[PDB]
Short mmCIF file of C-alpha atoms in Angstrom, two decimals:
data_model
loop_
_atom_site.label_atom_id
_atom_site.label_comp_id
_atom_site.label_asym_id
_atom_site.label_seq_id
_atom_site.Cartn_x
_atom_site.Cartn_y
_atom_site.Cartn_z
CA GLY O 1 103.93 113.67 120.82
CA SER O 2 102.89 115.98 118.59
CA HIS O 3 102.56 118.19 121.16
CA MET O 4 106.35 118.34 120.63
CA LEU O 5 106.66 119.38 117.04
CA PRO O 6 107.74 123.24 116.31
CA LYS O 7 104.75 125.51 116.47
CA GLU O 8 103.90 125.60 113.53
CA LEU O 9 103.96 122.21 112.08
CA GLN O 10 101.84 121.63 115.27
CA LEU O 11 99.14 124.07 114.11
CA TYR O 12 99.10 122.15 110.63
CA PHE O 13 99.18 119.25 112.09
CA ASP O 14 95.81 120.28 114.20
CA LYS O 15 94.33 121.55 111.36
CA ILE O 16 93.97 118.56 108.94
CA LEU O 17 92.81 116.74 111.65
CA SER O 18 90.33 118.93 112.26
CA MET O 19 88.85 118.89 108.99
CA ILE O 20 87.99 114.73 108.86
CA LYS O 21 85.25 115.80 110.44
CA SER O 22 83.74 118.74 108.14
CA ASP O 23 82.65 119.82 104.89
CA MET O 24 86.82 120.12 104.16
CA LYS O 25 87.02 116.53 104.33
CA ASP O 26 88.10 116.42 100.57
CA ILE O 27 90.89 119.06 101.16
CA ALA O 28 92.47 117.64 103.70
CA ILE O 29 92.66 114.02 101.79
CA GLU O 30 94.28 116.49 99.13
CA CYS O 31 96.93 118.56 101.38
CA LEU O 32 98.09 114.99 102.25
CA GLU O 33 98.41 113.68 98.49
CA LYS O 34 100.52 116.90 97.62
CA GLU O 35 101.66 118.69 100.46
CA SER O 36 105.57 118.59 100.89
CA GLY O 37 107.50 118.90 104.63
CA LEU O 38 105.22 115.98 105.96
CA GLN O 39 107.83 113.73 106.53
CA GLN O 40 108.35 114.78 110.47
CA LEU O 41 104.44 114.61 110.99
CA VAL O 42 103.59 111.49 109.34
CA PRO O 43 103.92 108.93 112.05
CA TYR O 44 101.70 111.28 114.03
CA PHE O 45 98.83 111.48 111.39
CA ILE O 46 99.33 107.59 111.46
CA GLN O 47 99.31 107.41 115.39
CA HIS O 48 96.11 109.64 115.16
CA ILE O 49 94.21 108.13 112.35
CA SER O 50 94.77 104.55 113.61
CA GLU O 51 93.18 106.03 117.19
CA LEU O 52 90.12 107.53 115.11
CA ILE O 53 89.11 104.43 113.37
CA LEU O 54 89.01 102.66 116.92
CA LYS O 55 86.60 105.41 118.14
CA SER O 56 84.40 105.71 114.96
CA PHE O 57 83.42 101.62 114.26
CA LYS O 58 79.83 103.47 113.75
CA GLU O 59 80.71 106.23 111.44
CA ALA O 60 81.18 104.58 107.76
CA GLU O 61 81.97 108.17 106.34
CA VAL O 62 84.72 108.61 108.78
CA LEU O 63 86.29 105.15 108.36
CA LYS O 64 86.17 106.31 104.57
CA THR O 65 88.09 109.33 105.01
CA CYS O 66 90.62 107.66 107.53
CA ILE O 67 91.18 105.24 104.39
CA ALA O 68 91.49 107.84 101.92
CA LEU O 69 93.92 109.84 104.24
CA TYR O 70 96.49 106.56 104.72
CA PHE O 71 96.20 106.23 100.63
CA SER O 72 97.12 110.01 99.97
CA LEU O 73 100.31 109.79 102.42
CA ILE O 74 100.97 106.83 100.77
CA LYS O 75 101.02 107.93 97.45
CA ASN O 76 102.65 111.34 98.43
CA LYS O 77 105.36 111.76 96.28
CA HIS O 78 107.18 113.68 99.18
CA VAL O 79 106.63 111.00 101.97
CA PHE O 80 108.83 108.15 102.54
CA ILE O 81 106.05 105.96 103.68
CA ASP O 82 108.38 102.45 104.29
CA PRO O 83 108.85 103.16 107.45
CA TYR O 84 105.34 103.24 108.69
CA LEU O 85 103.37 100.86 106.16
CA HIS O 86 104.03 97.79 109.73
CA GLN O 87 101.77 100.98 111.68
CA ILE O 88 99.28 101.73 108.48
CA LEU O 89 98.49 97.75 107.54
CA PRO O 90 97.33 96.29 111.25
CA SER O 91 94.88 99.76 111.15
CA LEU O 92 93.62 99.31 107.62
CA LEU O 93 92.96 95.53 108.39
CA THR O 94 90.81 96.32 111.29
CA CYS O 95 88.81 98.32 108.77
CA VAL O 96 88.73 94.88 106.42
CA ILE O 97 87.85 92.51 109.44
CA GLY O 98 86.20 94.73 112.33
CA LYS O 99 83.24 93.38 114.49
CA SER O 100 81.84 96.61 114.98
CA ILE O 101 81.58 98.01 111.47
CA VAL O 102 78.22 97.81 109.81
CA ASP O 103 79.28 99.26 106.51
CA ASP O 104 80.38 96.32 103.49
CA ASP O 105 81.64 99.63 101.56
CA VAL O 106 83.85 100.84 104.33
CA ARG O 107 85.35 97.21 104.57
CA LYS O 108 85.94 96.96 100.62
CA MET O 109 87.44 100.08 100.44
CA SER O 110 90.01 99.26 103.23
CA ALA O 111 90.62 96.07 101.43
CA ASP O 112 91.65 97.63 98.25
CA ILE O 113 94.04 100.13 99.69
CA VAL O 114 95.15 96.55 101.71
CA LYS O 115 95.73 95.45 98.17
CA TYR O 116 97.91 98.36 96.57
CA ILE O 117 100.51 97.77 99.43
CA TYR O 118 100.76 93.98 99.04
CA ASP O 119 101.12 94.82 95.00
CA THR O 120 103.78 97.67 95.56
CA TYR O 121 105.98 96.24 98.65
CA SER O 122 105.16 92.57 98.86
CA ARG O 123 108.64 91.84 97.26
CA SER O 124 110.54 94.20 98.79
CA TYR O 125 109.69 93.67 102.59
CA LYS O 126 109.63 89.84 103.20
CA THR O 127 107.33 89.80 106.12
CA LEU O 128 104.69 91.80 104.53
CA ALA O 129 102.43 89.02 102.71
CA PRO O 130 103.07 86.33 104.66
CA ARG O 131 101.53 88.73 107.82
CA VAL O 132 98.82 89.38 105.89
CA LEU O 133 97.44 86.13 104.59
CA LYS O 134 97.87 85.00 107.97
CA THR O 135 95.75 87.34 109.41
CA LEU O 136 93.12 87.19 106.85
CA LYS O 137 93.30 83.43 106.22
CA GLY O 138 92.58 83.14 110.01
CA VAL O 139 89.76 85.84 110.42
CA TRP O 140 87.90 84.02 107.45
CA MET O 141 88.70 80.11 108.97
CA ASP O 142 87.41 81.26 112.67
CA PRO O 143 84.13 80.03 113.46
CA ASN O 144 83.59 82.69 116.17
CA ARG O 145 84.08 85.31 113.45
CA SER O 146 81.01 87.68 112.18
CA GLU O 147 79.56 86.86 108.68
CA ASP O 148 80.83 90.29 107.99
CA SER O 149 83.84 90.00 109.65
CA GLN O 150 84.54 86.87 106.94
CA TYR O 151 83.17 88.25 104.20
CA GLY O 152 85.63 91.11 104.71
CA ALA O 153 88.67 89.02 105.20
CA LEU O 154 87.47 86.57 101.91
CA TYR O 155 87.09 89.86 99.63
CA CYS O 156 90.39 91.07 100.78
CA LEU O 157 92.20 87.76 99.81
CA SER O 158 90.03 87.27 96.39
CA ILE O 159 91.79 90.32 95.14
CA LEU O 160 95.19 90.18 96.25
CA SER O 161 96.35 87.86 93.07
CA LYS O 162 95.51 84.65 90.91
CA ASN O 163 98.23 83.08 93.39
CA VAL O 164 96.25 83.73 96.32
CA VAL O 165 92.82 82.72 95.42
CA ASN O 166 94.48 79.37 93.92
CA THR O 167 96.77 78.93 97.19
CA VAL O 168 94.53 80.03 100.41
CA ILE O 169 90.92 80.17 98.51
CA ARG O 170 90.55 77.15 96.89
CA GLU O 171 92.61 74.84 99.55
CA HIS O 172 90.37 75.98 102.42
CA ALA O 173 86.81 76.26 99.96
CA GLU O 174 85.46 73.03 100.99
CA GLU O 175 85.88 73.38 105.07
CA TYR O 176 84.53 76.56 105.07
CA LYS O 177 81.59 75.53 103.73
CA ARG O 178 81.48 72.37 105.26
CA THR O 179 82.10 73.97 109.17
CA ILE O 180 81.07 77.49 108.91
CA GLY O 181 78.78 77.96 105.99
CA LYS O 182 77.53 81.66 106.22
CA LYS O 183 75.86 82.47 102.98
CA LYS O 184 77.34 85.71 102.89
CA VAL O 185 80.48 84.30 102.49
CA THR O 186 79.79 81.53 100.28
CA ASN O 187 78.09 83.60 97.96
CA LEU O 188 81.20 85.53 97.72
CA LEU O 189 83.27 82.03 97.66
CA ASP O 190 81.08 80.83 95.04
CA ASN O 191 81.67 83.97 92.76
CA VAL O 192 85.65 84.47 93.37
CA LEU O 193 86.01 80.30 92.44
CA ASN O 194 84.00 80.31 89.23
CA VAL O 195 86.65 82.55 87.86
#
């Protein structure tokens, strides 16, 4: 727990978190991409940020800051992110598919980070791509899921690769249209399949 960190590291950790909901959010995003010596804080930042996303479904600007903080830690040349991708990915996927999110820009922004992880790490870590594809195809094809959830799931699938569009999307398009057919989803589907 963060209460067990050396004093100076807990104070820095608390300072960054306090900047998320403030006019200094952009400085916090820069700090997490550029600062050295943050490795010990990494699991705690991910744990707090994941918890904050669950509490912030109706705060689009807070969700965007959370997604940007994850990307900063992923890009930080002074951090080793690989052991934490298993915790970041489901939190980003909650922003893509979450039922309580009202902003499409949040879903797309998070989907862009999922794509970066997919492109960067799927060939290194075998379980990564199957887990991501299973979650997304599951949400898109679920008749109980909302229009916005299915849209986020399809948008994310659509940007991963041409092979995902051709395997996953092309294979299930007719079943989606026949059995669910939510207009916002079918509109996206028609645009994806024309390319």
